[PDB]
Design a protein around this ligand. Structure first.
Ligand SMILES: O=C(O)c1cccc(O)c1
Ligand SMILES: O=C(O)c1cccc(O)c1
Lengths: 271, 271
């Protein structure tokens, strides 16, 4: 049984101490490749974007109790802009940000907005000075670049009290926008496998034990990844504490609302 | 400046490592004693139930960045029953809790139910085996008796996957019922102070540092309280992980909705 992992910081509580059982191997790679690897059969299980799970819910099931979800701001799914949203004419989409385009478009439609979207490469600040009013960033780079815009953090100030603007750049958090729109959590990723190929029970148990270790030792998890990202430990710690990892009823509700808005007529979501 | 704390398990990550700055003292006691001390001015800040804050929002404000809230099940606010809710003619109450009764009454009115609430003595299981078919339990007892009913954990089963029924007893979670009703978090407690008399910055800073230590070391916090409660470390750990401690916009929305239903005409909630 083969597993494809994506090594975003927000799954470190699950993956940093994971010990594969006998008879399971794992590869790592970009979200692009894991999606491809799961459909073709290169891997049997992978943590894939929500929209990828939804669009292939005919073929794929998800683990019942694993998610990357959040209620409120997520800090790593970010629209950086220099003008108000109704004025946006051109939004750049960076490398991995194509899985959150569907959420961006849902939010833009509800406001009646339709800027042109273009694939680009670079950081938010450099793309904002290379012909774009808006830049969509996800993952570790989004978190670091959010902090670059609105930080630094001082001892008296706290991560949640930081402004959303800095140096003429506003950082719009799409998970907060989703909360403003629906009142509900947003589910960004699940653990998906072909319906006729369930994962071995030893894999699920090792995954649950690693998540329990990571949740139990969040300062240790956070310190390792803050060093790699160049951020304060407390930034990463609050970042990880915000996530919802157990795909519970509120997470499934937001997943289903997203599915209906972004992939109407999707096959039924099964776990 | 005087603090009055109630050391419920769910505030352990905030209060267990708290180091009071110079010129701040703390006492402890039961909620009703602490509420009165706050309102009469013999303490200056206290963690009080949501109802207590809502009913005295004329003269109290709440810290903007501290809460006890949850989205979905809370596990320590439980209605145990052997028959469907519409067939309950009575519901036993063991403790005094204005908070959980006001929540229970909100849920029951929304469904057009009206069982009689009666004070009684015992555990959920002795009262059900006696003259009742419905029992409300809160706190440590509610958490321990939920586990007695639906447990125990195994290497394969986790807390999230446990059934909500056991031995013919259904455990209805009032926070999950609140989510089913509203889609939103429920805020059980805030840190309240008289509007004249906001806390000194050093206390807030100390509380923020204590919370970061507790959140960053959940296994350590959980093992202490798990041993005191006779529960697996894994139960307390997930229990504590499940809370929302920062009084963010979804938490305030849940709080205001509860304010509107349970305390009609309440003064405006201020932070
Ligand atoms: O945020 C994640 O962990 C994640 C994982 C897979 C796909 C994706 O869009 C996001
Ligand atoms: O759940 C709590 O921490 C709490 C704190 C104060 C009053 C109350 O009813 C509940």
């Amino acid at each position: 049984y083969r597993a494809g992992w994506i090594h975003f910081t927000n799954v470190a509580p699950i993956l940093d101490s994971l010990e594969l059982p006998p008879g399971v191997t794992a590869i790592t790679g970009v979200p692009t490749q894991m999606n491809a690897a799961l459909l073709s059969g290169e891997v049997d299980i992978a943590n894939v974007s929500a929209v990828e799970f939804i669009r292939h819910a005919d073929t794929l099931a998800a683990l019942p109790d694993f998610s990357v979800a959040v209620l409120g701001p997520v800090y790593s799914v970010n629209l950086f802009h220099t003008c108000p949203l109704p004025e946006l004419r051109r939004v750049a989409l960076t490398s991995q940000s194509a899985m959150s385009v569907a959420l961006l478009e849902v939010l833009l439609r509800q406001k009646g907005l339709s800027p042109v979207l273009e694939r680009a490469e670079g950081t938010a600040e450099s793309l904002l000075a290379a012909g774009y009013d808006g830049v969509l960033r996800i993952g570790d780079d989004a978190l670091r670049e959010w902090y670059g815009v609105v930080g630094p953090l001082t001892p008296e100030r706290t991560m949640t009290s930081l402004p959303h603007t800095g140096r003429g750049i506003t950082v719009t958090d799409l998970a907060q926008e989703w909360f403003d729109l629906t009142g509900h959590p947003f589910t960004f990723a699940v653990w998906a496998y072909r319906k006729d190929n369930p994962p071995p029970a030893a894999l699920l148990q090792a995954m649950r034990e690693a998540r329990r270790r990571g949740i139990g030792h969040l300062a240790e998890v956070s310190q390792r990844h803050a060093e790699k990202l160049g951020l304060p430990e407390r930034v990463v710690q609050h970042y990880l504490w915000n996530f919802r990892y157990h795909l519970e009823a509120p997470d499934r509700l937001g997943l289903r609302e997203f599915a209906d808005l972004a992939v109407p007529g999707h096959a039924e979501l099964t776990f």
